[PDB]
A paper describes a structure:
Botulinum neurotoxins (BoNT) cause the potentially fatal neuroparalytic disease botulism that arises due to proteolysis of a SNARE protein. Here we present the crystal structures of two BoNT cell binding domains, HC/A4 and HC/A5, in a complex with the oligosaccharide of ganglioside, [name] and GM1b, respectively.
Consequently, all subsequent analyses below involved molecule A. An initial inspection of the map revealed large positive electron density at the expected GBS, which indicated that [name] had bound. For HC/A4, eight residues form a total of nine hydrogen bonding interactions with the three principal oligosaccharides, GalNAC3, Gal4, and Sia5. Furthermore, HC/A4 displays no water-mediated interactions with the ganglioside, while both HC/A1 and HC/A3 have at least two each. Although there is minimal overall conformational change between HC/A4:[name] with HC/A4 alone (RMSD of 0.88 Å for all Cα atoms); there is a noticeable change in the relative position of the HCN and HCC subdomains when compared to the unbound structure (RMSD of 0.6 and 0.5 Å, respectively, for all Cα atoms after individual subdomain superimposition). Therefore, upon ganglioside binding, the two subdomains appear to rotate apart like an opening hinge. Inspection of the HC/A4:[name] GBS residues revealed changes in the relative position of the side chains compared to HC/A4 alone; most notably Arg 1282 (which adopts two conformations in the unbound structure) and Tyr 1123. HC/A4 follows this trend as the structure displays a reduction in hydrogen bonding interactions with [name] and has a reported 1000-fold lower activity in mice.
Residue numbers in the entry: 877 to 1233, 1236 to 1277, 1282 to 1302
Write the structure that this text describes.
Amino acid sequence: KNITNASILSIVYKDDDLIDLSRYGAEIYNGDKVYYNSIDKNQIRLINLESSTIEVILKKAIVYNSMYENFSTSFWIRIPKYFNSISLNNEYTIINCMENNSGWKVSLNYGEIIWTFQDTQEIKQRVVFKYSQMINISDYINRWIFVTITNNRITKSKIYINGRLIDQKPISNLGNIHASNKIMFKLDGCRDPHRYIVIKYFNLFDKELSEKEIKDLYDNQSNSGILKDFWGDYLQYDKSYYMLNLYDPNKYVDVNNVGIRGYMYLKGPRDNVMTTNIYLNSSLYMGTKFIIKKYASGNKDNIVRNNDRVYINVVVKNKEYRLATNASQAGVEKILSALEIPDVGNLSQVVVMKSKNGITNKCKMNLQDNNGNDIGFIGFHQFNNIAKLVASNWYNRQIRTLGCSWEFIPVDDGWRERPL
Ligand SMILES: CC(=O)N[C@H]1[C@H](O[C@@H]2[C@H](O)[C@@H](O)[C@H](O[C@H]3[C@H](O)[C@@H](O)[C@H](O)O[C@@H]3CO)O[C@@H]2CO)O[C@H](CO)[C@H](O)[C@@H]1O[C@@H]1O[C@H](CO)[C@H](O)[C@H](O[C@]2(C(=O)O)C[C@H](O)[C@@H](NC(C)=O)[C@H]([C@H](O)[C@H](O)CO)O2)[C@H]1O
């Protein structure tokens, strides 16, 4: 509540332009090469060209010398995977608030997010969040990250990642820090010509936010009633997704045969994608693609929301089939099939999409019969040496990471894969 009262700058897209949602009406000038996402116009893409800039000029009325002695900043960022060795040891600024090399800045490097304070004598202080690109599945590479930095010139600068304290360093051993009236959003000194960032909801606060305020800010801007894909964008209808099971990520979905005599199952291992000394990850663009189809969502847009009731279509050899099961089979594990859409009949197929209950959970798909009864969340079961996909009320009772925990993965420009 008093988090909006501490705002001195709050950038959002509104009615065909970026505007300040604080009461101080900062001037905001865009370059010719700034882009906005058509599904979420608050997502701002800046590329590595001189004309891809956002310059903010704060009104002189709100600029005073000690305005950055006690203040915080928050924003979301999505950083595409580094793939070129020119990016190693190439620190580059993305948010600059400095005059004569004094002030504060946010910068990036290979697997790093960096906050830097710098007085007029060139005494720097940095706090850093580090993530590796040598990792099977990363929570950070090309996925939306919530960043918060808090500053108290008596004590410490602190960087938080997804509401969690990462690094903290004292900033009391610092001289005079200039207070610029300008914040420059721009990739400054990046040698990767194809580098870009995506940001949203940049905020400036006139106080050092607590852990509690940071957590609550992370949760509100997380939109917990909307389902997310793997990258943290809104999950969507009529969109193709590769499936990743969070209990067994070194697997991908395959279909034995279409029809009621067949089944879907987790097959492994995944291939690796690599560039020597830059990254080594599991391939994400593998296996049978899922498509979510509207059944009873009345909302006109294509966004999947908590409790939406849907059909799941399954792509096999460029043809769509219907995920379904005969719930009358014996046992609580109901093996799933991929049926010709005309042949579904009265078999169970209606799926309740879940993001939370208000406890958020990664188990996304609760299959129902045609009388409103739970058949179970969609996961898998080890039958001998084959892990077949099932719906099972066992999951519903347990509801940690379970076999029903899934991520939906679309092809994204920030994660490029090329086989052979
Ligand atoms: C361990 C097991 O068999 N779990 C069954 C569950 O077992 C019931 C009791 O809880 C068991 O103690 C008891 O044991 C008997 C055996 O059934 C019997 O054949 C044997 O001869 O004697 C034992 C008695 O000493 O059995 C009863 C049932 O008879 O029964 C339920 C039925 O509701 C489940 O089938 C269950 O297996 C679990 O099934 C769900 C789907 O319904 C799911 O597949 C669970 O699997 C995962 C998961 O998706 O989370 C995935 C992994 O394959 C699985 N195992 C391993 C080794 O990694 C893990 C873990 O089991 C754990 O749940 C972590 O998530 O979970 C699957 O376990």
